[PDB]
Design a protein around this ligand. Sequence first.
Ligand code: FMN
Ligand code: SF4
Ligand code: SF4
Ligand code: SF4
Ligand code: SF4
Ligand code: FES
Ligand code: FES
Ligand code: ZN
Lengths: 430, 142, 235, 162, 108, 99, 60, 49, 114
Amino acid sequence: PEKTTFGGLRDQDRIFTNIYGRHDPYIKGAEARGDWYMTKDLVGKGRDWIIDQIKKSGLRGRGGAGFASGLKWSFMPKVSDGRPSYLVVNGDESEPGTCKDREIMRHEPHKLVEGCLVAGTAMGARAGYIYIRGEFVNERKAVERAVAEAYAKGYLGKNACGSGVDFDLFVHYGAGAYICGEETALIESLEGKQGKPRLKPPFPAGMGLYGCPTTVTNVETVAVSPTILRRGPEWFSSFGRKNNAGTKLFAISGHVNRPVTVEEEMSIPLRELIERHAGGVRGGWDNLLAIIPGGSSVPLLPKKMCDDVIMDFDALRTAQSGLGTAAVIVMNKDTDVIDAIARLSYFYKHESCGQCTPCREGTGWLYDIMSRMRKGDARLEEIDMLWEITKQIEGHTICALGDAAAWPVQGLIRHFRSEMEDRIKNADQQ
Amino acid sequence: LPADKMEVFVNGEAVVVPKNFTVLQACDAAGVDVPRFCYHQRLSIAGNCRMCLVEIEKAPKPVASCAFPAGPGMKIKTDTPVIKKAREGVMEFLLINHPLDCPICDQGGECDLQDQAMIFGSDRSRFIEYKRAVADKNLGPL
Amino acid sequence: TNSTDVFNVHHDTPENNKDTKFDFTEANYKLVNKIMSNYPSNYKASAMIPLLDLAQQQNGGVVSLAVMNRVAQILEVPPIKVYEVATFFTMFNRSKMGKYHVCICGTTPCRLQGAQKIEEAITKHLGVGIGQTTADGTFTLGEMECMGACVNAPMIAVADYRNGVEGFSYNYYEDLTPQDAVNILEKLKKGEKPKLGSQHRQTAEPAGAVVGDKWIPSSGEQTLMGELPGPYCRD
Amino acid sequence: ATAPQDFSLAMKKADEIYSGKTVKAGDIGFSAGVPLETYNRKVRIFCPAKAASQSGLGRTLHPSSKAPQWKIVFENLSKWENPLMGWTSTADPLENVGRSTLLFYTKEEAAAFCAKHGWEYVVDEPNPRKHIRQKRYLGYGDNYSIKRKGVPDLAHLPSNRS
Amino acid sequence: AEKNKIPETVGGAAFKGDLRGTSAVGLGDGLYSHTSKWMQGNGKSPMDYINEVEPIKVKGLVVASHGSDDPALGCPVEYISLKGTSYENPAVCKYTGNRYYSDCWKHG
Amino acid sequence: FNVPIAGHGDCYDRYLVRVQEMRESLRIIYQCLNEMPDGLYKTPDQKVSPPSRGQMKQSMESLIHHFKLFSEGYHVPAGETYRAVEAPKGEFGVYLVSR
Amino acid sequence: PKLVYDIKYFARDYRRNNSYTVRSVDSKTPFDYSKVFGSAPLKPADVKTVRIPEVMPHRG
Amino acid sequence: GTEKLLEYKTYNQGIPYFDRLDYVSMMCMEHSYVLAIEQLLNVAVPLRG
Amino acid sequence: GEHALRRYPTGEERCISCKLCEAICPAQAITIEAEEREDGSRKTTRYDIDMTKCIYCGFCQEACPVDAIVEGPNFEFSTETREELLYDKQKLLENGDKWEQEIAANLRTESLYR
Ligand SMILES: Cc1cc2nc3c(=O)[nH]c(=O)nc-3n(C[C@H](O)[C@H](O)[C@H](O)COP(=O)(O)O)c2cc1C
Ligand code: SF4
Ligand code: SF4
Ligand code: SF4
Ligand code: SF4
Ligand code: FES
Ligand code: FES
Ligand SMILES: [Zn+2]
């Protein structure tokens, strides 16, 4: 937590404690680990107190947005106009580099349920829905068992936890779509239609599920909120830098000696994280072509930038990338960056719902151009054309999947244009 | 501005419109004609084609006129060069997968796509890849 | 290399056509009622996806035209809505499906750690290819995107469509080298149930990585070792 | 609606500076020198409605439109088929002149032209076009309103059920 | 018979039972066939020519059709869907009338 | 090239002028032949000039432009102009009015 | 040709980008004859000439 | 009636009128017409043309 | 020279009744009316050219997108009555058949330039 240096989080400061499933993930272990401790008091203190404590903690939103959780929760209506309020937890964790949410769902189900209770009381939501990926059948079974147990002991329902508050929780599951993770597209999917995002000028706080005020929040934010109210906002604020306070779950994947999911305070150096928790890059730090810091949506960073880069939101924004999800992917010198970015382009071409013209057409265009560049078929001007097309897509789409499709290609153009030019010229030469 | 009527600025000119209009409705009231493909007066608003994009000083990125509610004191720019570039890009995306069926199309002289390509589009293409192909199905005698 | 469904329109088949009759069994109908109870009565269409999943599990893994028409009738909606939702999502299979549906993730984090060689070994040993059912009908091969198992990158997912709703399981096999994949598929052919989750390690602990065809066991720094902190309250 | 700010500026300014001397109705028709039976033909002064195929508003009377849109048209006369080649034959001298060239900015301009030449005319006003959306789908937000099926009934909640 | 029959399409580039778009040419003379209206002889019609040509097998689910062999000396480039096509029911190029079919969709 | 000039104004003077104009035109042709550049012969803009045939047969935008230029034609902005050329018989000019 | 892969007509659109400004002229304000004849040559040496334009405008 | 016929044709449809105005010198006659249309259209001719 | 409608090497007429050649005709010498053929093709039931109204500009050959209409290399086509100078679809197709090889060679040469 020291302002000069950040890293080396201790076990006493870790929110997610059975993340590795060495203990019983169900209610007996949850109670023995400190779950559902004094939820009666925290809920009874009123929605306003919870909102102010979350605001003071500085908890920004996990899941990619980074928007302050307290302000988003405070956008919820205070008094009913005849429309109930709903809490939907976005447990859809589709992202090519992110695996972190699955461990929370399968090994800490009760922290998530208790957090849903706390947040629904903070926002005055009568009912709650936990959206889960359809592929996560076993994780859904774990969450459903947690919900049933909480209902059995009276933690949920009317007079939940003994306080004069009423909250009902349901578990809903999709059928597989990356787009269904977006806030409006998730609402459309849960209503029963195609998971196509809704234009934002109507906002979900104003009009959401069944036309009623709703808030969509990630499992990780919902899970961390109750312990934030228990441990204290100052404790949560201490770890990170200014405006970037909390600890976050880092999922290291790719060419590392040990791929691990770990919890660490934000503003750790990326080199320190990779070397301590991941065991170092396969073949040493010297053997780095590039690292994708925040899952596939954000632009990649070359080794040189990865040397001094710090694992934070605003700093990665300064480094022309972003910490969407703490899903860091490491590539060796052996790796072909072109093929991986082409696979990401195919991913986005496959995951576009097709609603708006720019995404529906430009993502397939991007995939085709990247496929030709993967073999060297293209010309040297094709790179400039590719940059122009990425600029055409960005900002002109309904949701951010167009931006998430454009960004990796832009990062490839920006940092590894030399390798693309080499591949294009050599194929013509040979 | 009697009661329900508000004031909006379109290209620096004052237009008095009811509060319930959108940006596209006010632009029509101002005499400006916005390119549209999916918007229809008597149908539900969709917002998918993204050809109506205009500029609002408050908003960072271009918004769809058909589905954007107009606000008091809003300034609407339909001729900024960024809007022209966005129009050209949307037109390119519309035309990359369109079949080259103009001579055999019965919409040849009455096509919105051709007219807005001529007016709000570039004169040349950069697409060299395979276009999409669909198999037609019978919808009836008419 | 297209997947099971190549058509976004109804392809008439002797198995799948209008005359085919599908209805929920009484126990499955009770499950239908419990599924619907979660959503408001007036907004009943919210159950479309869970009902389609339940019908897929009952019908052996195929969402037929009769299945879609039955779901549309039960939800009191025009059938085109159910057609659209059954066509949009990936898990909904609208073509005949084998006993097992083996899916290999080909997204980037898996492709770095060797998803290509996993699929190549599986398609050699099985002998059919992606999107094609085995001649016996025991496995149908499919490629899907990231499955949420990126730390355990080389991975496959198998769905048990044999028993039905009572005996359907969607399991993940992780940290697998090609030989491990072949072993899992042979165990599945025998009917023996393999090791759930990753073969070499339990979950995403710091235990090692799959390099090439071998698992390199490296154990360095561990974090959650020791006594867990437990309950605490501010005073 | 603001201003064209082009050659049309000088066109309108030339219009407002100059004027025509008043003459009795029909006197100019004698000066024209055309057959006098031409003025026995009846005139319809109308503005074309929008084609249903296209959504452009240029042809309509809209503030966007800056071109003359009021036509003088004459009634349709006999047409037959050429016996040799099946071509459409006609004897009407005024078949296409009115549609092609007689364009006027305002209805009063066309009425003045007809009265000056002595043509009897009937003016047809276009059906008014008002760009007003219905209350059900007044805005994009109305698509996902509670109006679709009512406020969600909460009698399905486990607390209310139990 | 042809005087009271509904104009119909054989279905090579259309469907077996659809209406045929028809003008009123030849209606007075009593001609009701497309070729009869413009050809008065008893020779072989161009439709007879195009039917005689046989469908061509291609690989893939889409074929590029330029009409002629040289792209700039024929019809505009066209991309035809090969899905749901067989020898008996081939896909057709609208400009040229050439017929195509593929077995790739059947995983072959 | 040099202007041919005579002073009397009679028929003979104009005949001599016309012969010398033929010689000057030959000189101009020789200069054109030697300095003939390489490149485009028509304007690159395809909203006023037809696209080439291979280009229309390969590009959608070029087919649209070809169709709208060979059916409707280009729209000329409102204005008036008088452009004159030194025709062999004198000064030939067109006064074009566009609405 | 740099227009093959770089398409932007609005930057290269000269047809629709012409406009007409407006001024008002009055007889009260005297004409500036200093402009007309102050720059006029008084001797053969001071004569300045305008050369014939060699080519008409082209985009290249 | 050449001048009135021009009014019923499009600009490209009216070029042969100028060729036929003077059968001795065709090119010079059509040249003025194309120059006037180019001035109104603000079109720049390449050097080879 | 003399006009000629052309056929594909299979024997199918190249004309697709786009009607651009009739719209571009400065002299209004082309009258076209079409229909859907029984197979389903877009084909003309009438294509007649007035050769006493034609000015042989070649605009129709420029406007055709499929090279269906071409002005052939034949200038010996004088007639003794004006009725024989009103060509029709059958006559134009016969002229295309008669001069096919020469027209094809000329088009192959011309394709390089345009
Ligand atoms: C295409 C797309 C996919 C997304 N997928 C997810 C996802 O899988 N999980 C998630 O939490 N957010 C996802 N998001 C971000 C959503 O906006 C998310 O519901 C919201 O940011 C959650 O807010 P929070 O930060 O308070 O949790 C996605 C966004 C887009 C545009
Ligand atoms: S950007 Fe892509 S995913 Fe998002 S609404 Fe548009 S088409 Fe759908
Ligand atoms: S006429 Fe319009 S719809 Fe038809 S092919 Fe051409 S651009 Fe497409
Ligand atoms: S050559 Fe010219 S005048 Fe003759 S038919 Fe063709 S377009 Fe018409
Ligand atoms: S000859 Fe050519 S331009 Fe004329 S209708 Fe036939 S295809 Fe169209
Ligand atoms: S008209 Fe299509 S987005 Fe508005
Ligand atoms: S990339 Fe395969 S499970 Fe994440
Ligand atoms: Zn073809």
